[PDB]
Each structure stands twice: as C-alpha cells, then as structure tokens.
C-alpha cells in the first residue's frame, strides 16, 4: 500500500477499497 | 480522526482500516 | 458485482462532496 | 438504500444529501 | 440512467486532461 | 457541500455532479 | 473564472452553480 | 454526441479532443 | 468496450493505491 | 487476467495486489 | 493536453487514457 | 522516472507517452 497523504476524495476512495464489504464511516475533520 | 491521521500525516493500511465498520 | 462496485466508487466520491464536514456512513448488509 | 436507489437511476446531489451524516 | 451517468463522469475527467486550458462544453439536450 | 479548494479534475467532477442535466462549461483558467 | 474562484479560493455550492449551462 | 459516440465504444484521447473548446 | 474501459480506469487507480512504490504493469493483448 | 478476473466480479485489495510489480 | 503536475492517481489515469490499447508500466518513484 | 518528470515537473503528452508499453 502507498506511503502518501491521502486527502479529500482520495482518502474516501482508499477507504472504500480498503474496507470492502464492511463499509466505513467518514467523519471528515474531527 | 482519519483526516488528521492519514491526510495531514501519512497512514499505513492498518491505520486506514480503523475507519472500516 | 463489478457494476454495483463501480457505482459505489462514484457514490462515495459524490457523498464526500455533498456532505463535506458532516461526513457520512457507507454500509448496507 | 443508496445503492438500489442511486445505481439503478441517477441520484442528484439533493438526493445524495439524504445519506449525509 | 446510471451507466451513462457513470460514463459521463469519466468523459468529463478525460476532457479535462485532453483539452487543458482550452476547456470544453459538456451538454446535450 | 464541502469547504475546499476544488482544483483540476475535482473541480470538473464537482461541476458535473452540481449541474446535473443542465451540463456545464469549463473554461479552465481565465 | 471558475478556477480563480473555486480552486485558488474556496467556493460555495451557489458559486459553483454559476458555471452550469 | 460524445455520450452516444463515447459510452457505446471507447473514444481515444484523439477522439475526445474533437469535443474540446 | 466502454464498460470494460470504465472498469479499467478504476482498476488502475486501485493498483496505484495497493501497489505503492512497487508500481505495476497494466497490459493484456 | 486482471480485467476478466476483476471486471466480472469484485477483486479486493488482496486480489489486486497479485498484479503488483 | 494539460500543462499541470500530474501526481498520484492522476498520473496513472492520464497514462491509462494516453496509452489506450498499448497499456503502460507505472514504476512510481525511481 | 515518470514521477520525477511529470509530477515534480510538468509533462507534455509526448513525454507522458514514453511510459506506454
Ligand atoms: C450496498 C452495500 C453492500 C455491502 C457493503 C457496502 O459497503 C455497501
Ligand atoms: C453522483 C452519483 C454517482 C453514482 C450514482 C449516482 O446516481 C450519482
Ligand atoms: C448527454 C447529456 C444529456 C443531458 C445532460 C448532459 O450533461 C449530457
Ligand atoms: C476516457 C473515456 C472515458 C469514458 C468513455 C470513453 O470512451 C473514454
Ligand atoms: C478496486 C476495483 C476496481 C475495479 C474493479 C474491481 O474488481 C476492483
Ligand atoms: C485487458 C487489456 C487489453 C488491452 C489493453 C489493456 O491495457 C488491457
Ligand atoms: Cl490533489
Ligand atoms: Cl464506472
Ligand atoms: Zn486528486
Ligand atoms: Zn466509473
């Protein structure tokens, strides 16, 4: 897996693909 | 949160997986 | 499989934009 | 859900907002 | 609906690249 | 909707999704 | 233009909609 | 148009350039 | 054509993420 | 290949990694 | 074609679309 | 490599095509 800043939409896509069937929660900024 | 961990710093895959359900 | 998987990718990117700081849950099982 | 509503037909940004939060 | 909608998303991203500063119109109705 | 710099391809995608059936014009830099 | 308004500065949705046909 | 030409079959970058400007 | 072409776009973006610095070949003919 | 394996059914990140390098 | 930094996933997408049926090799950093 | 040529500097289309098979 990459060693990169995953930000904005890339962060969400990477989540999408990492989590597969589990799905995910995206809080954005905390 | 995920932004502060993986956007402002860099994340491992394992670190990214913390945000799966 | 793939077609709904490919759709899913676009939905999440759309959600990111529309929701902003609110964020969103993405799930259904 | 979102997939059955928004992968069969087009969901506008207004429709997608329903799924925020 | 969706399949041509999903295609559309990819067309516009392609257009952005190929067209550059020229830009482009995206429409058809 | 986000509070972010929408640049390059993200700007065009965001347009695409915001404008729906109307479509849009993308001038790029002016 | 849209780039100077929404890329170099940040745009509202309403501001983005100025660029629809 | 572009959708009927480029969503049925693959449009190369050369083909897509027709729609620039 | 397009459907496998649209899939291809998503595969390569996935590959970019999963492979990282390793990179990858994308081909098949 | 990847297209026939991963466009017919969903390839997870684990499956896609097979095609790295 | 654009005059831009193509980085990360944009670089790979741009490759994908530029190379068409030939395909490509993405070494990432060298 | 492609990153050093097209990401850290800007690339022409011709320069990008060096990375096709
Ligand atoms: C609709 C659906 C099913 C399974 C997993 C998901 O993330 C989404
Ligand atoms: C924005 C978007 C993506 C995918 C499907 C849709 O109906 C809408
Ligand atoms: C082809 C088409 C129809 C309607 C709206 C659009 O933006 C594009
Ligand atoms: C680049 C691209 C996107 C979508 C359809 C096409 O034929 C070509
Ligand atoms: C991540 C990804 C993209 C496209 C098809 C797949 O099966 C998986
Ligand atoms: C599967 C396939 C066929 C032809 C070209 C490609 O880049 C990939
Ligand atoms: Cl970016
Ligand atoms: Cl798609
Ligand atoms: Zn980006
Ligand atoms: Zn797609």
């Amino acid at each position: 897996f990459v060693n990169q800043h995953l930000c904005g939409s890339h962060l969400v896509e990477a989540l999408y693909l990492v989590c597969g069937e589990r799905g995910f929660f995206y809080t954005d900024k905390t | 949160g995920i932004v502060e961990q993986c956007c402002t710093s860099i994340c491992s895959l394992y670190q990214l997986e913390n945000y799966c359900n």
Side-chain angles (χ1 to χ4, degrees), chain A, chain B:
Chain A
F1 209 84
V2 292
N3 273 219
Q4 292 139 25
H5 297 296
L6 296 166
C7 303
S9 72
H10 306 293
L11 219 201
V12 161
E13 185 66 70
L15 265 194
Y16 184 63
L17 306 170
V18 161
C19 301
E21 27 170 273
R22 287 167 279 171
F24 65 82
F25 58 98
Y26 177 69
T27 61
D28 194 66
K29 293 176 285 292
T30 68
Chain B
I2 195 175
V3 174
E4 299 79 21
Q5 172 163 69
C6 302
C7 172
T8 87
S9 317
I10 61 127
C11 266
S12 89
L13 204 223
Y14 206 53
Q15 293 179 6
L16 268 187
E17 286 182 289
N18 288 145
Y19 307 105
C20 315
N21 302 133

